Amino acid sequence: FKIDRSVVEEFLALDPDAWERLNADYTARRRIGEACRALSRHAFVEEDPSALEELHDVLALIYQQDFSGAPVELLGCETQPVLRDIAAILEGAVLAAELDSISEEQISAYPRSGKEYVHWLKRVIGEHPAAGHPFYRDFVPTRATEGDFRFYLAQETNLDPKFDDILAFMQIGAAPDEKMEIAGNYWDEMGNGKPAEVHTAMFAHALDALDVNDDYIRRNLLPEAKASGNLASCLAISRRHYYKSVGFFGVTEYLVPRRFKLVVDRWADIGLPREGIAYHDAHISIDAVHASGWFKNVIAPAVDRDPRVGREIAVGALIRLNSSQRYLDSLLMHLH
Amino acid sequence: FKIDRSVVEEFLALDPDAWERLNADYTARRRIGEACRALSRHAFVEEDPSALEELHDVLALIYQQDFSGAPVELLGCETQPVLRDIAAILEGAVLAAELDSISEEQISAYPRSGKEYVHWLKRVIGEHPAAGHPFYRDFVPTRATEGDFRFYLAQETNLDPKFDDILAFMQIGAAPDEKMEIAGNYWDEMGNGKPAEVHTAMFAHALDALDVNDDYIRRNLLPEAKASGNLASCLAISRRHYYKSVGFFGVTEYLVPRRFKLVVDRWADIGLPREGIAYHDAHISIDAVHASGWFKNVIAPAVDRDPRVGREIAVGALIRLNSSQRYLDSLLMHLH
Ligand SMILES: N[C@@H](CCCC[NH3+])C(=O)O
Ligand SMILES: N[C@@H](CCCC[NH3+])C(=O)O
Ligand SMILES: [Fe+2]
Ligand SMILES: [Fe+2]
Ligand SMILES: [Fe+2]
Ligand SMILES: [Fe+2]
């Protein structure tokens, strides 16, 4: 028995009684798990490109159930016993592969106090090529066309359309200082209460401005873009990945202003719809404040509370940087 | 093989390799599930009081992992395959028992438009005895002592200490109007950014004012209080329970002002610490606004979007009312 996206699609078509029957059958569930481990092996031991994309198509479908409003037809279907087993197996393989790229020396030399840790982390980020990737530094200012930006924005649907809920998952159970900062960040994503300023709505308008429609996205989404989106989902939704999440989205906020400024200037230079740039325009200022608040009020207090979490935060930062690098290298390569 | 709280405690003591070994052994996992179904039968078919409390002690331990910041020692432990199977089985039994108390006629006669549905729901709530329970209407104004309030507050740790995260879970994936309202409610729970006004912090101060310490809570928490807390957790953390959640916490906001006004007036009448009443004092005004916003901006738009969800919202409201009734009846009975 093989597992792939269509198999999980079929699962999600079952009615509530079919799900209950599947959930009671641990022989069928063992078979599902074994199929997941085999898919994992093809994806990350063999590194078969098709199996890797299949694995991320499966994870993306499951996270869709975690992150999207459930349809009325699914309300009685107990999907957690099977979907969480599938996600645990494929996630474990995805994360083991990220960790294979991270050395112990990268994640252990940090100072064991909060303010010092922030300086160290900013330096560690600055050394990574993703912090100044040529897609933003060279390709965008000098060559990016409307067709380029439309392809790029399609990749970016992996993260931006769900940033508010990533923050809402993350802050669950967080200590007070960290929680307060993530809460204020979430409230900013929610337009501070003004529907026109909600960030997902403004991102959607940029997508409409370049006709980044759902079918264009489906055809053009890169495997590395899928993996980036899946990593962000994976880390946000488990409490135990919280400190990884802190590093992963700390890097994210930190890098947005330099990246979006390059996109915005080029977007205006080639006369693209001023309506669409509003999303990126906004974040250039906002995320300088978000990055500063995140370092000062999330990362530094967590490290001061328990310096052992500096290692987790560093892992999550490097996961963000490494996966961003693979995504931008693949993106630039497809854009020629 | 039997399952109980201590067995799940032992699971949570395993190291990451032990969890990985357990997760790969579907024979051990089948045995765990079968033990859960047997515990369920004792709890809800036999209605053995001890098995029922054991079942809710197990669920409470699992939800603790879902809602609490993970300790550094647990960060590498993949608990989802087993804990989610246990939760799915015990939850299914808890919810089937709630639904046994809900008739089809209760949840089908509603008007299929949002503003009308709100009037109908408010009437349905008004007919339930939990909407004017004698614990608040008779016992509190005339007899409640400091020792009574301390016992009561211990029961209330089932819900209030996690209300902000219940809202954060709920709003995941919500449609825009509903999301905006839940977001503003969450931001209010977060003191609108002022740490002194964060609601969990003010609830904790009321607990300190009466010495509602962790050991007092552990000894005095009633089984119905545990079930109330577990219901709230169960509904909030699954997307498919969202519309139940909408009814469950809609009833919650609606009932707070009348309930807290009675508690506050009596608290002041018997000279208890003015510091502690600040929590309840605040909510009397705030939750009149929260209830109005919830009906107008969560319930009515959801029903106007898809009237089929009126049935789910009604189920969740009645689950709240029924479980509140059992909890307050048991509470009043223990207070003599
Ligand atoms: N997609 C952006 C992050 C935007 C964060 C959402 N507010 C990036 O990869 O740089
Ligand atoms: N424990 C309260 C609900 C308080 C809601 C938290 N802000 C009740 O049962 O009425
Ligand atoms: Fe944003
Ligand atoms: Fe931001
Ligand atoms: Fe509150
Ligand atoms: Fe409220």
UniProtKB/TrEMBL annotation, chains A, B:
Gene3D superfamilies found in the cross-reference section: Heme oxygenase-like
Keywords: Oxidoreductase
Keyword Oxidoreductase on entry: yes
Keyword Oxidoreductase: yes
Protein name (database record): HrmI
Molecular function as annotated in GO: oxidoreductase activity
Top-level taxon of the source organism: Bacteria
Coiled coil residues, start to end: none
InterPro entries: Haem_Oase-like_multi-hlx, PqqC-like
